[PDB]
Design a binder for these strands. Structure first.
Ligand SMILES: Nc1ncnc2c1ncn2[C@H]1C[C@H](O)[C@@H](COP(=O)(O)OP(=O)(O)OP(=O)(O)O)O1
Ligand SMILES: [Ca+2]
Length: 269
DNA sequence: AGCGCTACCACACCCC
DNA sequence: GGGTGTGGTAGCG
């Protein structure tokens, strides 16, 4: 109840035959989610970075299908982000990154593989869920200085109550590595200034977290997220949709497969 | 006209 | 000297 108060109190201050199409832009994030409620269509909220170098964002509301239609060519709608709605069920995902200069002998492949091998073990012990690297969409946005990878888990009929509970799960199973201010040593890496922190970014599990979309780049640079070469997740091939659209749907954190046997995973801190 | 939030420091308090 | 709860802005993500 304390969260919805900050949203309502910020709102009072902020105010002081064509084919079926839905394409609404909103200056405020709250306005977008309000429209989603009074919509009835399977619509979702995206965030676009404005030409301003800062993180100033505008919020687009439309379906996953229509969005990809005006987005697949990559001539327009660059620097887009998925708004992971709070309280909404979502997939297990990761934001992985370390500074290459400050970490000479850190192999990016073995680190992500060992990380997956560990989380999969954790999913088995705590929740009985079983999966392997074959269920992990591996994306890359690395440069010559930053090894940047996004992992989106594609679990069979499983999801988390929301992204906050995802964070409680990772802080829990990554506590052995958090103590290093289960041999989770490969997680520790030297940051920008040689300070030792974790290979896993635990700051992407907040309410209404933006998350850069598949084939999008930050407004600054020009390196877009793309599927790695060692990725082991392959969507099912369908004749009614393109393979790129399959990866796009898989990459969406808040696009949980509709299933009549869905298990919702929770985790309190 | 983005939206969330904690890492950090400062202070106030208590304890034998 | 240690230890614990409270503000409150700067700054990351
Ligand atoms: N100023 C911001 N405002 C809102 N959301 C942000 C902001 N900065 C980062 N985020 C969100 C979107 C990002 O996809 C998410 C992860 O942060 P970040 O690591 O800086 O971007 P990224 O991981 O997608 O690219 P990369 O790590 O390769 O630089 O946090
Ligand atoms: Ca990142």
């Amino acid at each position: 109840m304390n969260r919805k108060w900050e949203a309502k109190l910020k709102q009072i201050e902020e105010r002081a035959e064509e084919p079926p199409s839905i394409w609404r832009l909103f200056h405020r994030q709250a306005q977008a989610f309000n429209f989603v409620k009074s919509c009835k269509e399977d619509v979702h909220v995206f965030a676009l970075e404005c030409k301003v170098g800062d993180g100033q964002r505008i919020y687009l509301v439309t379906t996953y299908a229509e969005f990809w239609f005006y987005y697949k060519s990559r001539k327009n709608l660059l620097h887009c982000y998925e708004v992971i709605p709070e309280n909404a069920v979502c997939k297990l995902y990761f934001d992985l990154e370390f500074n290459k200069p400050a970490n000479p002998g850190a192999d990016g492949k073995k680190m992500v593989a060992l990380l997956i091998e560990y989380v999969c073990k954790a999913l088995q012990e705590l929740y009985g869920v079983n999966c392997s690297a074959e269920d992990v969409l591996n994306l890359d946005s690395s440069t010559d200085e930053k090894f940047s990878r996004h992992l989106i888990f594609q679990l069979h009929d499983v999801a988390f109550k929301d992204n906050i509970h995802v964070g409680n799960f990772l802080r829990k199973i990554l506590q052995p590595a958090l103590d290093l201010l289960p041999d989770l040593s490969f997680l520790v890496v030297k940051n920008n200034m040689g300070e030792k922190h974790l290979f896993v970014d635990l700051g992407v599990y907040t309410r209404n977290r933006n998350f850069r979309l598949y084939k999008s780049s930050k407004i600054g640079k020009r390196v877009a997220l793309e599927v790695t070469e060692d990725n082991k997740f392959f969507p099912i091939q369908s004749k009614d949709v393109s393979d790129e659209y399959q990866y796009f749907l898989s990459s969406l954190v808040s696009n949980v497969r509709f299933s009549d046997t869905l298990r919702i995973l929770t985790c309190e801190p």
